[PDB]
Curated annotation (Swiss-Prot), chains A, B, C, D, E:
The keyword Hydrolase is annotated on this UniProt entry: no
Protein name: Transthyretin
Keywords of this entry: Amyloid, Amyloidosis, Cytoplasm, Disease variant, Gamma-carboxyglutamic acid, Glycoprotein, Hormone, Neuropathy, Phosphoprotein, Secreted, Signal, Sulfation, Thyroid hormone, Transport
Disease field: Amyloidosis, hereditary systemic 1: A form of hereditary systemic amyloidosis, a disorder characterized by amyloid deposition in multiple tissues resulting in a wide clinical spectrum. AMYLD1 is an autosomal dominant form due to transthyretin amyloid deposition. Protein fibrils can form in different tissues leading to amyloid polyneuropathies, amyloidotic cardiomyopathy, carpal tunnel syndrome, systemic senile amyloidosis. The disease includes leptomeningeal amyloidosis that is characterized by primary involvement of the central nervous system. Hyperthyroxinemia, dystransthyretinemic: A condition characterized by elevation of total and free thyroxine in healthy, euthyroid persons without detectable binding protein abnormalities.
Effect of substituting residue 76 to V: In AMYLD1; amyloid polyneuropathy
Length: 93, 93, 93, 93, 93
């Protein structure tokens, strides 16, 4: 037998985030997985990845430059954060 | 036997996010997976990926430049955040 | 037998984050895993990864430069933080 | 037998973070794992990783430079910190 | 038999962080592990890792330079710190 009980009875008004997982049993390889159920990515960067099998093999002249700059703003009040009977505000005077 | 019970009885007015998964049993390879059920991507960048098998193999002259700049703003009040009986506001005076 | 009981009875209005996992049994390899259920990535950078099998094999001339700069701001009030009967605010006078 | 009971009865309005895991039984290899259930990454950097099998094998001339600079600010009030019947604020006069 | 009871009865409004784990039984290798359940990484850097099998094997000329500098500020009020019936504030006059 295998029984899983989550949140059988609720009487009020809650704020919930539920994730239930029950299991019974060349260059990049991934198999038989679960990735990023409740996931947040903000300002994620990747430049070079898995270029090939034989890149720049013979007499390569490469100049690599990466500039991250400038005015960038990120304002968040609640992130993966449930609330109940509260007050949430973002004010920019 | 295999029984899974989630949120059998609800009496109020809640705010819920539910995700239930039950399982019974060349360059980039992925197989038999679950990816990004509740997923948020904001300002995600990727420049070079999986260029080929033999890229720039012989006598390549490459100049790579990546500039991230400028005025960019991201304002979010609630992200993956359920609420009940509350107040949410974004004000820009 | 295998029984798992989580949050059987609730009488108020709470704020919850629930994650339940029950299990019964070339270059980068990953198999049979669970990754990043409740995960937040902010300003994550990766430049070179898994370039290939034979990159820059013979007589390579490479100039690598990585500049991180500029005015960048990240303001967050609640991150993976549920609340109930409270006050949350982000104010920029 | 195997019984696990977590948070059977709740009478108030709490703020909770729950994670329950029950188990019954070339270059980088990982297998049969759980990684990053409640995980926060802020300003994480990686430059070179898993370049290949034979990179820069013969007569390589490499100039590597990594500059981290500039005005960058990160302001967070609550991180992985649930609260109840409280006051949370971020004020920038 | 194997019984585990955590937080059977709650009468007030607390702030909790719960993590329960019950178990019954080329270059970098990891297997059968649990890593980073409640984990925070701020300003974590890694430059070179797992370059390959035979990197820079013959007559390599390498100049490595790593500069960490610039005005960077990190301000956090509560980190992995739940609170109840309190006051939390970050003020920048």
């Amino acid at each position: 037998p295998l029984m899983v009980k989550v949140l059988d009875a609720v009487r009020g008004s809650p704020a919930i985030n539920v994730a239930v997982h029950v299991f019974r049993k060349g260059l990049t390889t991934e198999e038989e997985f679960v990735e990023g159920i409740y996931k947040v990515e903000i300002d994620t960067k990747s430049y070079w990845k898995a270029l090939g099998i034989s890149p720049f093999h013979e007499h390569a002249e490469v100049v690599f430059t990466a500039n991250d700059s400038g005015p960038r703003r990120y304002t968040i009040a609640a992130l993966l954060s449930p609330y109940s009977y509260s007050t949430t505000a973002v004010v920019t005077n």
